[PDB]
């Protein structure tokens, strides 16, 4: 007397058709379900009073906002000549190099992106009344902020996603609201009298967004959570995988910028961002899943999985979330192997596209910071190769900014380490970013911190070593008369310091930059075998001490070297040496005898102005032969810092 | 009105093993009600008529959720069955009950 066979007699009015379904036959053909578990789950013998009492309990929308959205062609056509790589079978001979086309198969990749399996749809109070118990291979993103009094858990299969907002308030009522996204043809099974059109909020030609909660849970949530489901559903369908991920990545940085990740105010945009983080992970795994045993282009994988890695690494610092799944080891090893096919120090010599493509694999290949510290040499080479080809003091390019941002993560991840072995290359990277932070740079960024989409995302000032960026001095480089959207000017300047949370910790480990004057440093400039500390006071345990003509109002400008990064046992005794003026220099040079030096110009009223690291001959040529040196303005001095620890002041050229 | 969904008497048991020949009814037949009667294989005359009336909307959604979860082995006989249960489930008075 086992589960063998049952007959289904349908009373089509007048016809009385009959059907049969055997449990024994198909319970073994497609295993993974037990009918008796669903039978004692649907309340077969439920009375009509209990079913209606359950129906009136779940909140039901008064309509369904219908908007026809078209979806983009995310995964490109297979490049003729690519090599199909098995995600489960990867050996160093599968690929030849970066300049070789490639694509990874979609079937083994799906088994790696959703290796973990678990019960997705729980039996909680709001969920056990609508859906059936489902248990598929899932990848979830879960976090909690206010001491576990507010939880979010967005679980997703290869075809649909479900996020769940759970806030427990004071006395113990736990208000639970959930949203479901995916194709209308693949939504989970509904239990009881519930239909989907009465529950979906936005329905496109093929996709739909459902909201499942009680009237009391929706009412209390409607006070502080009034999301824009129109634009939310439009961007979740019309945008690609990488573009949508970078979109959420930008709005996450804006939350970290002002408050947010330290004190999360339960805002409408705050909860809206948490859902879109799970959608960013979904659209990547969903686009791969919608390929019929084809292959996903490797260049597209590096372009999409780079965003998920940074997105997973930014929520681990912001909310301490947990992301299981959506991390295929075959891709992590195929990208890590691709590092031996290129040279790190010579990485900057490659094409701009190959530069950005190699840095996506640098983050995807070694996501865990510390497995390979030599990746800094590649990111430093990209920045070094970009400095020599960049017009001096000019703001960066959308392409160049994307190129340096896409590799700056391997620098930030190594900065989070307590001790690092790639010391010199980290000081070489921070020195170039310091020389790149010009007055025009923080002018376009401050202008881009209201309108530009890419400008506020990245800037070498964040990795710079400047310390004179006070709110007063940053306000002296506005984009315009400051009346053009005046409110955005003060909010952008107050936010620029908000994006100075580089090495703001929850572990106390920023001991990675010997002075007794901490909060009065103006700049640090590390050269070879000397690092100069520019400060506004005398107490710096250095091997010398120089003082330049400061302003007229008392704010002295000192700078002192430390030979070979070995500070002396005590401070200086006598008067600090005066910087000497030199005029005997040929403006037309034949060799880079200034290579390795640091040329810095400072004003007498607004403090420092520039910093120019002499890297090659092409840089020195655009320094002397240009109109950089302006000696008619007597209050604009030019201090040159040598590798011998000597400091000079260029006063004339011939 | 064709039958009635009753409160579960404490001593009445139901197991999917001994149940067969389930009867689903259209709306026009029972004033708009979704009524399903559960029976057993006809074992002759042993006093027993185990006609067990149940909530149809829950039974229909169960057989819809048990055919969609196994769509790979869905034959032509069951492909028509899944489509007829979908149209029967949507043609009911979910809200119209006073």
């Amino acid at each position: 007397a086992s589960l063998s066979e049952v007959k289904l007699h349908l009373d089509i009015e007048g016809h009385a058709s009959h059907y049969t379904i055997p449990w024994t036959e198909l319970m073994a053909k497609v295993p993974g379900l037990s009918p008796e578990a669903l039978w004692r789950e649907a309340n077969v013998t439920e009375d009509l009073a209990s079913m209606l009492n359950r129906y009136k309990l779940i909140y039901k929308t008064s309509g369904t906002l219908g908007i026809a959205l078209a979806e983009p062609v995310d995964i490109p056509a297979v490049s003729e000549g690519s090599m199909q790589v098995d995600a489960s079978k990867v050996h160093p001979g599968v690929i030849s190099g970066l300049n070789s086309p490639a694509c990874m198969l979609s079937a083994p990749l799906e088994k790696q992106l959703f290796y973990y399996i678990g019960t997705m749809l729980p039996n909680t109070r709001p969920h056990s009344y609508v859906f059936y118990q489902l248990r598929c291979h899932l990848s979830y993103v879960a976090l909690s902020i206010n001491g576990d009094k507010f939880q979010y858990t967005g679980a997703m299969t290869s075809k649909f996603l479900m996020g769940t907002y759970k806030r427990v308030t004071e006395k113990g009522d736990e208000h639970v609201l959930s949203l479901v996204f995916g194709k209308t043809k693949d939504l989970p099974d509904l239990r009881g009298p519930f239909s989907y059109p009465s529950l979906t909020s936005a329905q496109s030609g093929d996709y739909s967004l459902v909201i499942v909660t009680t009237f009391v849970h929706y009412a209390n949530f409607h006070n502080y959570f009034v999301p824009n489901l129109k634009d939310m559903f439009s961007r979740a369908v019309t945008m690609t995988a990488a573009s949508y991920a970078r979109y959420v990545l930008q709005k996450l940085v804006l939350l970290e910028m002002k408050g947010g990740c330290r004190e999360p105010e339960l805002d409408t945009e705050t909860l809206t961002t948490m859902f879109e983080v799970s959608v960013a992970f979904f659209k990547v795994g969903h686009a791969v899943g919608e390929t019929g045993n084809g292959c996903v282009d490797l260049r597209w994988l590096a372009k999409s999985f780079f965003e998920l890695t940074v997105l997973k690494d930014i929520i681990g610092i912001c909310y301490g979330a947990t992301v299981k799944g959506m991390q295929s080891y075959g891709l992590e090893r195929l990208a890590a192997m691709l590092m031996a096919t290129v040279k790190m120090e010579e990485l900057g010599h490659l094409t701009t596209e190959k530069q950005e493509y190699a840095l996506r694999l640098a983050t995807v290949g070694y996501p865990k910071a510390g497995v390979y510290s030599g990746l800094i040499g590649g990111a430093t080479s990209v920045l070094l190769s970009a400095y020599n080809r960049h017009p001096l003091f000019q703001p960066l390019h959308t392409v160049m900014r994307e190129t340096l941002f896409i590799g700056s993560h391997v620098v930030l991840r190594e900065l989070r380490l307590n001790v690092t072995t790639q010391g010199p290359n980290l000081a070489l990277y921070q020195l170039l970013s310091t020389a790149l932070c010009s007055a025009l740079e923080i002018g376009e960024v401050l202008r881009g911190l209201a309108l530009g989409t890419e400008s506020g995302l990245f800037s070498p000032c964040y990795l710079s070593l400047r310390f004179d960026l006070t709110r007063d001095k940053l306000l002296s480089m506005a984009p315009q008369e400051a009346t053009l959207d005046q409110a955005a000017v003060s909010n952008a300047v107050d936010g620029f310091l908000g994006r100075l949370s580089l090495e703001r910790e929850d572990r106390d480990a920023w001991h990675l930059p010997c002075v007794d004057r901490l909060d009065k440093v103006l700049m640090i400039i590390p050269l070879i075998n000397v690092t100069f500390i520019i400060s506004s006071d005398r107490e710096v345990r250095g091997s010398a001490l120089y003082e330049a003509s400061t302003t007229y109002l008392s704010s002295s400008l000192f700078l002192s070297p430390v030979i070979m990064n070995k500070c002396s046992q005590g401070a200086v005794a006598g008067e600090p040496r005066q910087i000497p003026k030199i005029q005997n220099f040929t403006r037309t040079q034949k060799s880079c005898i200034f290579c390795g030096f640091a040329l810095l110009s400072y004003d007498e009223k607004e403090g420092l102005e520039t910093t120019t690291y002499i890297t090659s001959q092409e840089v020195q040529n655009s320094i002397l032969s240009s109109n950089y040196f302006d000696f008619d303005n007597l209050h604009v001095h030019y201090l040159l810092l040598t590798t011998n620890g000597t400091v000079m002041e260029i006063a004339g050229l011939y | 009105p064709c039958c009635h969904v009753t409160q579960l008497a404490a001593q009445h048991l139901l197991a999917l093993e001994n149940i067969s020949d389930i009867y689903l009814v259209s709306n026009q037949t029972c004033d708009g009600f979704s009524l399903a009667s559960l029976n057993s294989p006809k074992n002759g005359s042993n006093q027993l008529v185990i006609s067990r009336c149940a909530n149809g909307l829950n039974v229909v959604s169960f057989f819809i959720s048990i055919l969609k979860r196994s769509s790979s082995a869905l034959t032509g006989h069951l492909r028509e069955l899944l489509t007829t249960l979908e149209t029967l489930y949507g043609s009911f008075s979910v809200e119209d009950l006073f």
Partner: antibody
Amino acid sequence: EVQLVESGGGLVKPGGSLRLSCAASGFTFSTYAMDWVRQAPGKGLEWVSLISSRSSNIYYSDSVKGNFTISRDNAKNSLFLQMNSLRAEDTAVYYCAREAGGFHSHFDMWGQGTLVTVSS
Amino acid sequence: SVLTQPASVSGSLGQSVTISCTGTSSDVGGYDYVSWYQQHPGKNPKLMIFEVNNRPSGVSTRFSGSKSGNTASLTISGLQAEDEADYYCNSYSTTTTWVFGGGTSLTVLG
């Protein structure tokens, strides 16, 4: 009275049209579903179109051409079986059957029958 | 598609004939919904046995059936009035929605 007798039609050229109208009276017409069953003069008993109650689901046999258009409306109690082209000279005695309804898949009532000869 | 019935079977006044009928496993051996219809020569047939051993109103206790595997056998029991008509067979076929048997002819010998 539960008389269920068709009006019917006479002979027809191979390439011809005919509309067999099965008039039924007495019972409730909207509660049951209607059928057509035809019998070849020798021994055959084949099945024809299946119009349901309120014209919701229409079925046909495999041997019937599929281009045998059936329809009905319960206001005027009748049952039209519109045949078109019937150029096959495969005639039969088209009875009008009555589906039992409920859950029973049997015929509880039958018709008198209609003779439609097709020759040249 | 039709069900295969015996061509012509004969019996005498007694319990002489219980005519058979068979079909596909999805037609008769899949549902207890076979049926039997008696047709006198040149007249309207009428339901003689609905389902299987379930008779309608107005039928003597001789008409019965058989619950075999995939063969339905109408049973006219041990008394024979002269009913020399043609017996037919049918059931709800999942494939054809209605399938009728070949058609036989019981002839009484008395």
